[PDB]
Design a protein around this ligand. Structure first.
Ligand SMILES: [Mg+2]
Ligand SMILES: [Mg+2]
Ligand SMILES: [Mg+2]
Ligand SMILES: [Mg+2]
Ligand SMILES: [Mg+2]
Ligand SMILES: [Mg+2]
Ligand SMILES: [Mg+2]
Ligand SMILES: [Mg+2]
Ligand SMILES: [Mg+2]
Ligand SMILES: [Mg+2]
Ligand SMILES: [Mg+2]
Ligand SMILES: [Mg+2]
Ligand SMILES: [Mg+2]
Ligand SMILES: [Mg+2]
Lengths: 65, 169, 298, 156
RNA sequence: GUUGUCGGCCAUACUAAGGUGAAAACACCGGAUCCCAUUCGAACUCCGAAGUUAAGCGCCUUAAGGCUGGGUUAGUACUAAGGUGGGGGACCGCUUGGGAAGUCCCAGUGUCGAUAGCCU
RNA sequence: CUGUUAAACCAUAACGCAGGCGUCCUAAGUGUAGCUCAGUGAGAACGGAAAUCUCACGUAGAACAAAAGGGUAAAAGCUACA
RNA sequence: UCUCAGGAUAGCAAGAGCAAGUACGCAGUUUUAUUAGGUAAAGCGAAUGAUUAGAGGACUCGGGGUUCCAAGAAUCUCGACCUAUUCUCAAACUUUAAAUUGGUAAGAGCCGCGGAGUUUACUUAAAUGAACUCUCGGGAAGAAUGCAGUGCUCUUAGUGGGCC
């Protein structure tokens, strides 16, 4: 037996073949890597903010407090 | 030339060290000898390397040294220098402006004899400093003393003669 | 002599920080002190600088800005002159005082005097306003001791007491406070004796000292206390404690910036001569020609 | 390559720059960072914790989270002909602010100013920047230096 | 003009041998009863005020060493694209682009701060 | 696993180079404090090339279990304590 | 992967579809803005490692031979230490340092320490900060060039000895 060990020849072209795919810029991004402190703050400051429209029963809870 | 009494020549310290090259009772003996000479507590220097000819195993207790200042080391210098007949050799004077001399027969210093006190060897070393030594020895803003503040050999010999009434060859 | 300082040596020299080669800043320490959680993005951080002089005890409130560090409040021991002390401005009591003043000033600047008084009568008991904080939390400061040693009963902690008693929050555990005892032999006790401490704040120690010096001889008392005694007489008082209670109440009462109204215009000629400007290239050239001729004709 | 380890082939990249030995660099300690800022990411070898993988040295990321000792940044890596988002967390040490936005804001504000004023006068101002343009006609009056090609000479 | 305190940059700040030193500070300096400290009150700590710019420190001096910046070096070495270019080859060179570094030259030699002050 | 081949992001072959891993450490982990190491010149009984003691100078040339490369000077090195 | 004539697995390929084909979008291109890098070269009177040449040297560290007379002094020979140099080199050396090249960007999802909000162990002495909401002010569209290859689903063939 004898073989060709590693060649990267055709792979670059193959990769450029259909273009290099880039992800979508999404206004709102996932929360990974963000600490819980800040996250709880967000949760609270959202729950209490009236200028942010909640669900009905939610607003009931918020308006009772 | 203008001179401040700031330029005073002072005895910085007298260090008296005794190297026995042993771990045993003779050490305890030199310890006692030293306490009795100084009034202070002796310092034990270790043995840093191993040598068969000297019988010294590394980090082994080797020698006893003492640092003395002020009138103590003054008075003692009296003692040893007299033991040396108030006579030194130019080879005894360093480029630090600091001088040293050897002594054996510690009894000639005026200390009594005991079986534990058998006659011992001693190295006497004297550091001479001018006033601003502090600048170098302090912690905050530590700096190196000026050229005009540091003591030349000739100056040190001059100090020994002028003070002790001694002879240099 | 093999020359052990070469051209190389100099090319290779790592020039230390201007501040470190002056033996002033401890950067390990400092970094430790300054770091705040980038979580609080721009929020300021407040350290108490206790710097002792062979004369004055300088207490400051500084915080760390990039470009510079800024001083909120400065208390210079000489302000105690303003209240009648000419001597012993480097003592423990001096620290205490200066710290009390820095304290009251900061607290006045913010508007916290009213809420925060402190323990007016001095005990030596742990005093941090942080236990009774209610409406607006006590001001937060960190002790920056600098190159000074942390030895138990250090002046810097005099300033500590001055300032937490002044009402600032200054985190301290009272372990290095004067008159603290950790026993060795049998593992006996952790002893705090606020009595000795307060005694030290007022300077009872200095007084007992006067007395000792008197016991031995008149010359003795003269040598160390000359200015101090004439000064004690000028205030017409028998002890430092009365004088420092005076300092305490005066400081507590109307601590404020003393603005010296002196207006000076233009007395500069003398020292402009002592502080020479550097020489022009042309000037060096001239120097060279001069040395050259002087040499040639010799 | 027989060995693959977090620091492989890191020798000269991570070695401190000449005469940088033991520089603490307090400035990085004080730099303020906000969720939307653009950070450039640069490793220092004295500070071992929160070390990014060598690949990311000199990359430009966008900040995403801020932790107490560390800024979460966002970079992308081309992998098999596609881009993959990577959420980095860098200790403060290996991070510095990028000027890529600073330039933008400065420029914009000035430009906008110009346009507002022009809008006052009825003149439409355009901020579009044009690249190097073909040189305009010129007249030249000068001293003529006439050169002739040198003979060959051998210098030994 | 000058000072202490805490500094950002970290030699244009360092190194060597010198001159100079208003004021106020900073220091050297005096002393170990007290908190503290060591083999030693050297240091660390504490308390001071008889001296002194001699030290430290400011400012300057050297056809100074170093460091910083430009010049030469040099369109040289290296390099991007082209070549049914030359040469047996090693290699060199043509067309269109980028473009260095040491010897030797010349200049520079700390800068930006917050705070309280000295010079009435 | 380190340094090279590897051609200044990354990646890159060969029974290609030079080496290293299947352990070791209640401290050689963690923290605080103080100290500055390697080396060089001059100086002190027995003392001798080499024992200890001194001072001046020492950009790091020493040390950091282990291979290599990088990292470290009021420390990451040395000492002491917890 | 007991794996080396094989399998899976991505990649490459076809067909059927989804979506408003954000064109203020896209790009194996430049430009512009901000930035990385230690290779080529060069450099070793600069660190590390090699490594030739001659001379000087108040002060030197030792050896040997010379001489004299005598043990010392005078002096030839060696090196080691500086002194000023000098020959030729490194992929597992490097201060310096390219070309080619890598990140990130070039605006309505913009800019402005102007406003009013929301936050029950988020931040601060601090309505301090922070993050999000509704406001206020300004903003010819914010480089060239090209778009007969918009993005994404679903199902799946062949391939996995290469060679110039
Ligand atoms: Mg693809
Ligand atoms: Mg500390
Ligand atoms: Mg680098
Ligand atoms: Mg230069
Ligand atoms: Mg050349
Ligand atoms: Mg691979
Ligand atoms: Mg092996
Ligand atoms: Mg430490
Ligand atoms: Mg077959
Ligand atoms: Mg498949
Ligand atoms: Mg189709
Ligand atoms: Mg368009
Ligand atoms: Mg390209
Ligand atoms: Mg660069």
């Amino acid at each position: 037996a004898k073989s060709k060990n590693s060649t990267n020849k055709n792979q670059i072209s193959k990769s450029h073949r259909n273009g290099i795919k880039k992800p979508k810029d999404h206004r709102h991004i996932s929360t990974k890597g963000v600490n819980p402190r800040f996250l709880r703050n967000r949760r609270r400051a959202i729950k209490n903010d009236p200028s942010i429209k909640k669900s009905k029963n939610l607003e009931k809870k918020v308006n009772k407090e | 030339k203008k001179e401040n009494k700031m330029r005073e020549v002072k005895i910085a310290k007298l260090v008296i060290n005794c190297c026995v090259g042993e771990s045993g009772d003779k050490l305890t003996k030199a310890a006692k000898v030293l306490k009795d000479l100084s009034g202070q507590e002796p310092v034990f220097s270790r043995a840093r390397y191993t040598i068969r000819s000297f019988g010294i195993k590394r980090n082994e207790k080797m020698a006893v040294h003492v640092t003395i200042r002020g009138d103590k080391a003054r008075d003692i210098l009296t003692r040893g220098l007299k033991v040396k007949e108030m006579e030194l050799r130019k080879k005894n004077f360093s480029n630090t402006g600091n001088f040293g001399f050897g002594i054996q027969e510690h009894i000639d210093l005026g200390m009594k004899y005991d079986p534990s006190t058998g006659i011992f060897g001693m190295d006497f070393y004297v550091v001479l400093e001018r006033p601003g030594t502090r600048v170098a020895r302090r912690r905050r803003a530590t700096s190196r003393v000026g050229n005009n503040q540091m003591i030349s050999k000739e100056e040190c010999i001059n100090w020994f003669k002028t003070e002790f009434e001694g002879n240099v060859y | 002599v093999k020359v052990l300082k070469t051209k190389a040596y100099f090319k290779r020299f790592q020039t230390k920080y201007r501040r470190r080669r002056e033996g002033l800043t401890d950067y390990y320490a400092r970094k430790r002190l300054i770091i705040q959680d980038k979580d609080k993005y721009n929020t300021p951080k407040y350290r108490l600088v206790a710097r002792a002089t062979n004369t004055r005890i300088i207490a400051q409130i500084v915080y760390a800005t990039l470009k510079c560090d800024r001083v909120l409040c400065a208390a210079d021991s000489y302000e105690l002159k303003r209240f009648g002390v000419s001597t012993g401005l480097a003592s423990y009591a001096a620290a205490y005082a200066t710290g009390l003043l820095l304290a009251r000033r900061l607290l006045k600047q913010i508007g916290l005097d009213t809420v925060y008084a402190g323990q007016t009568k001095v005990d030596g008991a742990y005093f941090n306003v942080d236990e009774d904080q209610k409406e607006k939390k006590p001001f937060k400061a960190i002790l920056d001791a600098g190159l000074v040693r942390t030895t138990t009963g250090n002046r810097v902690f005099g300033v500590l007491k001055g300032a937490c008693d002044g009402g600032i929050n200054i985190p301290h555990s009272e372990s290095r406070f004067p008159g603290y005892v950790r026993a060795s032999d049998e593992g006996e006790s952790s002893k705090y004796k606020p009595e000795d401490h307060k005694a030290r704040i007022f300077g009872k120690h200095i007084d007992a000292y006067m007395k000792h010096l008197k016991g031995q001889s008149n010359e003795a008392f003269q040598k160390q206390f000359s200015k101090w005694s004439k000064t004690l007489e000028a205030a017409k008082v028998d002890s430092v404690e009365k004088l420092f209670t005076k300092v305490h109440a005066e400081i507590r009462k109307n601590p404020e910036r003393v603005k010296s109204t002196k207006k000076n215009d233009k007395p500069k000629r003398d020292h402009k001569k002592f502080y020479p400007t550097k020489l022009t290239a042309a000037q060096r050239k001239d120097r060279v020609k001069t040395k050259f001729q002087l040499a040639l004709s010799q | 390559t027989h060995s693959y380890g977090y620091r492989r082939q890191t020798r000269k990249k991570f070695a401190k720059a000449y005469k940088t030995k033991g520089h603490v660099r307090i400035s990085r300690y004080l730099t303020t960072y906000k969720v939307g800022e653009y950070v450039d990411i640069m490793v220092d070898g004295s500070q071992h914790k929160g070390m990014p993988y060598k690949l990311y040295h000199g990359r430009t990321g966008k900040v995403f989270n801020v932790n107490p000792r560390s800024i979460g940044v966002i970079v992308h890596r081309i992998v098999n002909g596609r881009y993959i988002e990577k959420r980095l967390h860098v200790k403060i040490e290996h991070v510095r602010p990028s000027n890529v936005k600073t330039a933008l804001s400065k420029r914009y504000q000035a430009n906008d100013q110009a346009k507002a004023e022009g809008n006052k006068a009825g003149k439409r101002v355009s901020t579009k920047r044009n690249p190097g343009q073909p040189l305009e006609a010129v007249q030249v009056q000068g001293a003529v230096n006439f050169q002739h090609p040198k003979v060959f000479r051998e210098i030994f």
